[PDB]
Amino acid sequence: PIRLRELIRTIRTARTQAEEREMIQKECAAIRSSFREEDNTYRCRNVAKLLYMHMLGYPAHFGQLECLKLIASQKFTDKRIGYLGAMLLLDERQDVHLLMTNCIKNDLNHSTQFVQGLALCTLGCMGSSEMCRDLAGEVEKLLKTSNSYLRKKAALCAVHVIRKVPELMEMFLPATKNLLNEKNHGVLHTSVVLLTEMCERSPDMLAHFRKLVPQLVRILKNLIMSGYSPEHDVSGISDPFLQVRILRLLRILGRNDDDSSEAMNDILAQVATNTETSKNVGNAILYETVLTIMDIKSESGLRVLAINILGRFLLNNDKNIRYVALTSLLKTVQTDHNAVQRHRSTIVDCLKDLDVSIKRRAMELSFALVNGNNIRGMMKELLYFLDSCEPEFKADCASGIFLAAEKYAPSKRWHIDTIMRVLTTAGSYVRDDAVPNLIQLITNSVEMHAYTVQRLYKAILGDYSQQPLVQVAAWCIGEYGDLLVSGQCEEEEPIQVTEDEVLDILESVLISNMSTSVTRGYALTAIMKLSTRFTCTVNRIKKVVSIYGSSIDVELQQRAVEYNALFKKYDHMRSALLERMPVME
Amino acid sequence: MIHFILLFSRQGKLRLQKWYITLPDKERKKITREIVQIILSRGHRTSSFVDWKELKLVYKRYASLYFCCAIENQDNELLTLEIVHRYVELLDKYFGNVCELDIIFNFEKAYFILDEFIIGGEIQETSKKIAVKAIEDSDMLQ
Amino acid sequence: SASAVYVLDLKGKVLICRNYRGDVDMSEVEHFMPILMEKEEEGMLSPILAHGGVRFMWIKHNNLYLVATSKKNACVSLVFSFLYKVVQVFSEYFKELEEESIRDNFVIIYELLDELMDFGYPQTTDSKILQEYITQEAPRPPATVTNAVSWRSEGIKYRKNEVFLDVIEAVNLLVSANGNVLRSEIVGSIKMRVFLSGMPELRLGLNDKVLFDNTGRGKSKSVELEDVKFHQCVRLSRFENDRTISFIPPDGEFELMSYRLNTHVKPLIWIESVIEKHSHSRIEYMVKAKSQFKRRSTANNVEIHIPVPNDADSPKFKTTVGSVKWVPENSEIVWSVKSFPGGKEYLMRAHFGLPSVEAEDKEGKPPISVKFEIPYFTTSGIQVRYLKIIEKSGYQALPWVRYITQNGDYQLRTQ
Amino acid sequence: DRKGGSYSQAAGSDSAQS
Amino acid sequence: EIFELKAELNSDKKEKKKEAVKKVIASMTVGKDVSALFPDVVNCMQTDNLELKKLVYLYLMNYAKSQPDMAIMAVNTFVKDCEDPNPLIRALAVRTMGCIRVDKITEYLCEPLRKCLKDEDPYVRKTAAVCVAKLHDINAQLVEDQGFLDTLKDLISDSNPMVVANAVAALSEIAESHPSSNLLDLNPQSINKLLTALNECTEWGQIFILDCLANYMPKDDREAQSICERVTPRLSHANSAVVLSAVKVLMKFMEMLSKDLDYYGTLLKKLAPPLVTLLSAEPELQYVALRNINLIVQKRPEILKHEMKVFFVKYNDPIYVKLEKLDIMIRLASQANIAQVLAELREYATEVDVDFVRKAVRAIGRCAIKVEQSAERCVSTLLDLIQTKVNYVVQEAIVVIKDIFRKYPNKYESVIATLCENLDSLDEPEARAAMIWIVGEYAERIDNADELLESFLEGFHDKSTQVQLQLLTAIVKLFLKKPTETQELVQQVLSLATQDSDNPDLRDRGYIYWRLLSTDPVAAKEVVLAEKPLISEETDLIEPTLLDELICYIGTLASVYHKPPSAFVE
Amino acid sequence: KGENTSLLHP
């Protein structure tokens, strides 16, 4: 019987990774040999060693039957070891917990409180779709018990069952009725959590659960009055978890009702001024109260107080406080949007903050705060942030700028210029999914094509390694070759488009090593469409199409062969299928 | 609820692990490695809050071993820090001058205390003395 | 063209570094560890690292990685040769390859590193010469290095002139799981421990097929080694001209020649393995070993390693000759035999259970290899003719040599 | 004695080759 | 600590000074910034102890760039030590002078460099050459002003063959860093003199000697024959780097060699045993040997025609070594050992390396495509791999089958039925697109092609751009071939890819397909379902211009990277 | 070391 302490000391004594792995393998072999003999005396030490090995990163597939055997044992230590093994190495996807249902049911009626509590905790931690179905009746039976130490466990089991089985919440409707008078903090917290979970699962119980609003308000007032207590009094806040749960219930209770908001208005006003945010608990309580006020139909004074609190917390030098303030501002974006405009300077400064989370929150707030009047002004700031943004935020910044341009663009020309600048500066940071959106936006716009075509031609000849920019330029060329170059059928005066540079650029892109088979296909399609769109460069693309028909790629080879066949046998019918595609939202 | 709570050392060794979401073993190991890399590559002025995979990855280590949690974006961030501080205080009271070396030796006791404190990612014991008394009574049972 | 060669540790701490050119900042070593961790985690780890425009080639040593940062496209083979020479010199000077000796002989280590190479060009490569000029417990440099004869130090005086040769034979057999041997190569090794007075010029003579054909005696058993590599002291001009192996033997044990040619003979040991593994129920190990070597030869310390299941437990061995021990660290059963006479036939019958829970992922099928070593056997049939020991003073030498046959890459593909 | 083949005396050259 | 160390260093006790120096070295080696104590150690520099002088020189070299201003108090000590009778002291002083990265420090050392240029000691001569090379690298203009080129050129024509090799290496480095103007090329007498000293050169000296010949361009067959005869003995050297340098020199000489002469045949015959010996080198050098073989394989592939057994990847071989062996086997694949290659690929397909398995599958597919004699064997191996029930293995088999169908699909109609029901539930885009393309192009031997495409049409609008294009092409091909059972399928595909498809290229393809269907369905068979020509596979061999340049660049870092020397340096 | 130190130092 090797003790867990001895195994830990041996593991600590190993230095090389290979030596530690060999020691772990020897220990696992010893454990498997002991289990194969059906050892029951030193099973606790073997279980502890197996748990340590699994936590260290060692396989434990063979150590599944031993845990099941120890679960159905009689020793308290053996029962605890089995419960720990089921919680750690037993899961719904493992499928080894199916045989544990009978053991749980047998232990569900066990007289010992620790065994029943351990079984309930294991069931809650390893809740399965089928285990909850066969254990739903047992959970409801213990929900009506008067055991304060077991009421919290029963509430947790019911919440886990509801989360795993949303259709099983109907059986808990009458079990929790008349349970708002629990003196114990744990029982009351469990009841409040169960009520909140039931309300969030379905809105049918909102009316039934909304009747207890005065009781919750009275309980919150009593808790606020009783600010001193040896239990739950940490950092000057007594029952901070209970206060947070009450605030969350108030925010989620009556979110679209006036009576519920009016009933809790006095409690929210008292809490907003009777709570000190000097400690972390107080700051968290203030943030929760502000969030509840914002998410509910609170009064104008409550909204003003929440805005002032958010502004004060924004100036706090604490990184956690700044992150909380940014999250609250982002959540209260649609609500109190005009009042959020007073923190534009703070939002801009948060982008340059030395916190990755703080910078992300500031960027999200700036993106959500873009309106139809500050979009033009904020465009320069967004471009500067994207140009000097982190590699993980450059793509996100470009996506946000594109979304803002497509949503609240002041004008098509300004939006087109911003999109072109983003594509030129984004380079490889432009998302490939945004390419179809940009193509659709370009197709929809039919008023700015000559300038856009010229810009696309200028940008394509400069660089071609940008897959999104290259694809956008190819699509624009294919769509508006007839407008990019005017009078390019024959030799003319020196202009931007001469009817030959575009073909050479397309050929280079198709043959360039910087092709992912998507830009090459777009270039081939544009070249094929340019046969009818452009009448200046003719009789030369047919040879390339015929040569391009023997490409290594099956799709590319088939496309080249089809293009060559169309050029050689359907020369007159080329224009019959070269019509412009329809434009739709 | 807290999707997963694990205790990891500064060097990367994990002293605790408790996930409330059923994930594949390879996927769980990859997630733990990514969390360790993010925490191991984070400064002291990052606010101790990270939104990784849409999860409130809050990292706050009061010693060489660090502590991390992952909860959904539906509650206040300070609540997680308060719960972590309360759990640390309860563990210190149960053990007495808790150190990194004692954590490895008392892995089973720490797991039992964590199970008795929080179950399924939700708070189960709001009071601090009641949980300690229950843990002591369970330990005295044998 | 390595900018600087440094010795690292398993924790990423550099045990010792010595800059040679100064074209690369010393802080680049810190980024090597994260790069190695990423490459190992992504499968892109290679001995020749690359940190931007500076390449940090590293070699896994016994306890630390020998990182040699480089800047330009220098001789990678030259850098590898320098690293191997440095490792050999460290092994000669320090009997242990770990962090204990790295931090214990730094005073002499720095001097040895400085004397070894300068400006990226190695200069000193003789371990004996280095010990005669750099010691851990200084005079002018020895004239042997300045002289052409750097493989035989002059002035050596010994009471007796005894040379201990070693005919080391490496039998590598790559037998596929289908029963056919693909890679069957035998590599010779002519290593002599010459300990005499002075610097005698060895005149090697053996029963070589090429030599016999040239001399007209190509009718007896002559060894036709596909690859034969001369030592540093061996004169390549005589070998190219008429296969004359004339060279000054070194002071101590050294490898003069190493034959390397394919083998077309039957294997010395014929091992038949049977895997009667039930579906998560039991495992059968029908191992039968047949000695194809001559009965007059005995294989001392024969260890045929049979890989057992990774999750197998409670195994029972039913063999006839040779102790069988299952090593949990090795995760395999090794058919340990003290002495294996030629022609011996050993049959083994393994039987062990398997866990009920199926394995999440497969573990592969490592090949089965044996650790047989039967000395006093010359399978190749190459017989040494004579060793021309010539001394200017004139003395009677009594060289000795022993032929040792061992199992090298004798790996059999698993079924 | 020693494992791996006992050491044997070696000649100076091939006496039959002159 | 620091104050105590400074007080100890400012003492007159030799034992105390030695202890302080050892403590400083340990702190410096342990990672302690001892550069601030460099001025204190400057006074305690002129010491009779040789060990103390070495430590002081090392500290000054490590504290020279950190405190260049404080380094001005060591010129007198270096000048005094430059005349030390002990050759070791002179060599150490020469090494320290060139190791000091001080712009104003090398200026005052020009006179000592000139004095030590004619050092009689071969070690002293080598140290002087190294110092001259270091000064030239630090200051090429200073080296040119000092006029060390004339001394360096005459150094090769002197004794001390190791010193001659060191001087030759220094001269090559100077010319290598030179812009090629005023090259140090030598006439055939210099080559003969180097060859005479080649046999007396050491392992480091042999490499340096072989490096010089890499730049000279032979012009006569007799001179080339003599050079090849001289380099032949180098192949019997235990030095792997020496073997690699000799192989590179022989390959460079073979460029001007005449195939009619028997010298080329003898060189090719003697090279194979050298390649076999090099293949059995250390794992670190195994990758270098594999890269060198790959570089030389494209030049003289007939040299290693019979070298196939060694190309197998060893069980204990590294992942990089296994990849190199697989690449060599693929490049060295031939019809003579086709069965052996297939067996090795099957053996290599049973490994636990997912990347290794993918590489083995790719190599098997490349071998099957290159040689059509084993097309049936390749198809059988792919079928066995698919039946092996491996997700990655199944995807690799599907990709290989798709590649083979596009290359040799004339006799690929017998695998459609087997591949029709092959656990097509895989969602891998590479396998799914390949299967869709195979079904579309081979929609003749399968009577349930429409039924199979029905399952993949559920998420056609959100599967992928390439996957959606492949599905649309397969639907169009099925409609053109058999429109009776796919008349509604074609319309549904056109509606999904034309109305519900927002991709620009995909939308254009769908519109073109709809226009072709509505214009002339008969012409769609000759336009869409046309007989494509032979697919031009990309040649894996390097360009002849790059191959010639890479032949000279043998043993450099670019050979392992397979990049030009100017494309890898900074 | 750094491991025997108290997590909260209380």
From Swiss-Prot, chain A:
GO cellular component: AP-1 adaptor complex; clathrin-coated pit; clathrin-coated vesicle; early endosome; lysosomal membrane; perinuclear region of cytoplasm; presynapse; trans-Golgi network
Tagged with keyword Cytoplasm: yes
Entry keywords, A to Z: Coated pit, Cytoplasm, Cytoplasmic vesicle, Golgi apparatus, Membrane, Protein transport, Transport
Family stated for the protein in its record: Belongs to the adaptor complexes large subunit family.
Protein name: AP-1 complex subunit gamma-1
Compartment(s) where it occurs, according to its Swiss-Prot or TrEMBL record: Golgi apparatus; Cytoplasmic vesicle, Clathrin-coated vesicle membrane; Cytoplasm; Cytoplasm, Perinuclear region
Function: Subunit of clathrin-associated adaptor protein complex 1 that plays a role in protein sorting in the late-Golgi/trans-Golgi network (TGN) and/or endosomes. The AP complexes mediate both the recruitment of clathrin to membranes and the recognition of sorting signals within the cytosolic tails of transmembrane cargo molecules.
Tissue: Widely expressed.
Membrane topology: Peripheral membrane protein
GO biological process: basolateral protein secretion; intracellular protein transport; melanosome assembly; platelet dense granule organization; vesicle-mediated transport
Keyword field contains Membrane: yes
From Swiss-Prot, chain B:
Subunit-level organization: Adaptor protein complex 1 (AP-1) is a heterotetramer composed of two large adaptins (gamma-type subunit AP1G1 and beta-type subunit AP1B1), a medium adaptin (mu-type subunit AP1M1 or AP1M2) and a small adaptin (sigma-type subunit AP1S1 or AP1S2 or AP1S3).
Name of this protein: AP-1 complex subunit sigma-3
Pfam family, one: Clat_adaptor_s
Gene Ontology terms: biological process: intracellular protein transport; melanosome assembly; platelet dense granule organization; protein targeting; vesicle-mediated transport
One Gene Ontology CC term in the entry: clathrin-coated pit
Intracellular or extracellular location(s): Golgi apparatus; Cytoplasmic vesicle membrane; Membrane, Clathrin-coated pit
Membrane-related topology note: Peripheral membrane protein
Cross-referenced InterPro entries: AP1_sigma, AP_complex_ssu, AP_mu_sigma_su, Clathrin_sm-chain_CS, Longin-like_dom_sf
Disease: Psoriasis 15, pustular: A form of pustular psoriasis, a life-threatening disease defined by repeated flares of sudden onset consisting of diffuse erythematous skin eruption characterized by rapid coverage with pustules, high-grade fever, asthenia, marked leukocytosis, and elevated serum levels of C-reactive protein.
Gene3D superfamilies associated with the record: 3.30.450.60
This protein's UniProt keywords: Coated pit, Cytoplasmic vesicle, Disease variant, Golgi apparatus, Membrane, Protein transport, Transport
Chief location: Golgi
One GO molecular-function entry: clathrin adaptor activity
Family: Belongs to the adaptor complexes small subunit family.
Keyword Membrane in annotation: yes
Tissue localization of expression: Widely expressed.
Swiss-Prot record, chain C:
Topological type in the membrane: Peripheral membrane protein
UniProt keyword list: Acetylation, Cytoplasmic vesicle, Golgi apparatus, Membrane, Phosphoprotein, Protein transport, Transport
Post-translational modification: Phosphorylation of membrane-bound AP1M1/AP1M2 increases its affinity for sorting signals.
Keyword Cell cycle: no
Subcellular localization: Golgi apparatus; Cytoplasmic vesicle, Clathrin-coated vesicle membrane
Keyword Membrane (UniProt): yes
BP-aspect Gene Ontology terms: endosome to melanosome transport; intracellular protein transport; melanosome assembly; platelet dense granule organization; vesicle-mediated transport
Cysteine-cysteine disulfides: none
GO cellular component: AP-1 adaptor complex; cytosol; early endosome; lysosomal membrane; synapse; trans-Golgi network; trans-Golgi network membrane
Residue numbers of Phosphothreonine PTMs: T144, T146, T215
Protein origin, superkingdom: Eukaryota
Domain MHD: 160-413
Gene3D superfamilies: 3.30.450.60, Mu homology domain, subdomain B
Pfam families listed in its UniProt record: Adap_comp_sub (PF00928), Clat_adaptor_s (PF01217)
Modified positions (N-acetylserine) in chain numbering: S1
CDD domains: AP-1_Mu1A_Cterm (cd09258), AP1_Mu_N (cd14835)
SUPFAM superfamilies: Second domain of Mu2 adaptin subunit (ap50) of ap2 adaptor, SNARE-like
Entries under InterPro entries matching the protein: Adaptor_comp_med_subunit (IPR050431), AP2_Mu_C_sf (IPR036168), AP_mu_sigma_su (IPR022775), Clathrin_mu (IPR001392), Clathrin_mu_CS (IPR018240), Longin-like_dom_sf (IPR011012), MHD (IPR028565)
PROSITE patterns named in the record: CLAT_ADAPTOR_M_1, CLAT_ADAPTOR_M_2, MHD
Family: Belongs to the adaptor complexes medium subunit family.
Protein name per UniProt: AP-1 complex subunit mu-1
Provenance organism: Mus musculus
Gene: Ap1m1
From Swiss-Prot, chain D:
Compositionally skewed regions (Low complexity) per UniProt: 9-18
Regulation: induction: Up-regulated by IFNG, and pro-inflammatory cytokines IL1B and TNF.
Cellular location(s): Cell membrane; Endoplasmic reticulum membrane
Post-translational modification note: (Microbial infection) Polyubiquitinated in a post ER compartment by interaction with human herpesvirus 8 MIR1 protein. This targets the protein for rapid degradation via the ubiquitin system.
Region (Disordered) residue spans: 2-18
Phosphotyrosine: residues bearing it: Y7
Phosphoserine modified-residue sites: S6, G12, S13, S15
Expression across tissues: Ubiquitous.
Subunit description: Heterotrimer that consists of an alpha chain HLA-A, a beta chain B2M and a peptide (peptide-HLA-A-B2M). Early in biogenesis, HLA-A-B2M dimer interacts with the components of the peptide-loading complex composed of TAPBP, TAP1-TAP2, TAPBPL, PDIA3/ERP57 and CALR. Interacts with TAP1-TAP2 transporter via TAPBP; this interaction is obligatory for the loading of peptide epitopes delivered to the ER by TAP1-TAP2 transporter. (Microbial infection) Interacts with HHV-8 MIR1 protein.
Protein family per UniProt: Belongs to the MHC class I family.
Domain notes: The alpha-1 domain is a structural part of the peptide-binding cleft.
The name this protein goes by in its record: HLA class I histocompatibility antigen, A alpha chain
Shown stretch of the complete protein: 338 to 355 of 365
